[PDB]
Symmetry: C2
């Protein structure tokens, strides 16, 4: 059942945490190096960040130092967030479900 | 800065698992309830799945049996894939970091 889904999910997280790394970096850069922050946003315009690898591939050709920073940042981000994810997602679902099904229930009366 | 990014990630996960739960149920229903299967596909075309709570609320008006199955299944799928996601994602990030760092090294020789 699961391993098929769990894999697809993991790919999705891989791309998403990359996007988050870029955001994190984009924000620091908007303060520290406006020129770079603008460049990075212009790049994200010409390149669909969801294809995380094609994205990083292209950038390697244009700006080696930045993609090197993305690679590090996303790993650290990953480590720091992946710890508490199982529990959060599980309880949030259990809540949402509870809400939705009692929502439906009074929504009848 | 982890705790905020984690919350945003948990929210997109909850939403993605809802998309899977629906992919899963649609597949099953293909055999046992050909009608519902099609209906389920059609509905997703006129209410974006990406907006998971709005999606569910909309469906309570049209088919209660199905929305109640989508709730149960996504939680089941959740328990199934969640604990095995930290180890899986962290691995693939390490891997991808490697491949990129490497074909950079290849480039500048």
């Amino acid at each position: 059942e699961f391993k098929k889904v769990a894999k697809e999910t993991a790919i999705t997280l891989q791309s998403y945490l990359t996007y988050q790394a870029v955001r994190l970096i984009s924000q620091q850069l908007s303060e520290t190096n406006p020129g770079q922050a603008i460049w990075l946003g212009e790049f994200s315009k010409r390149h669909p960040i969801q294809e995380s690898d094609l994205y990083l591939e292209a950038m390697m050709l244009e700006n080696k130092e930045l993609v090197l920073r993305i690679l590090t940042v996303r790993e650290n981000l990953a480590e720091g967030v992946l710890e508490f994810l199982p529990e959060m997602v599980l309880s949030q679902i259990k809540q949402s479900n509870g809400n939705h099904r009692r929502s439906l229930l009074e929504r009848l009366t």
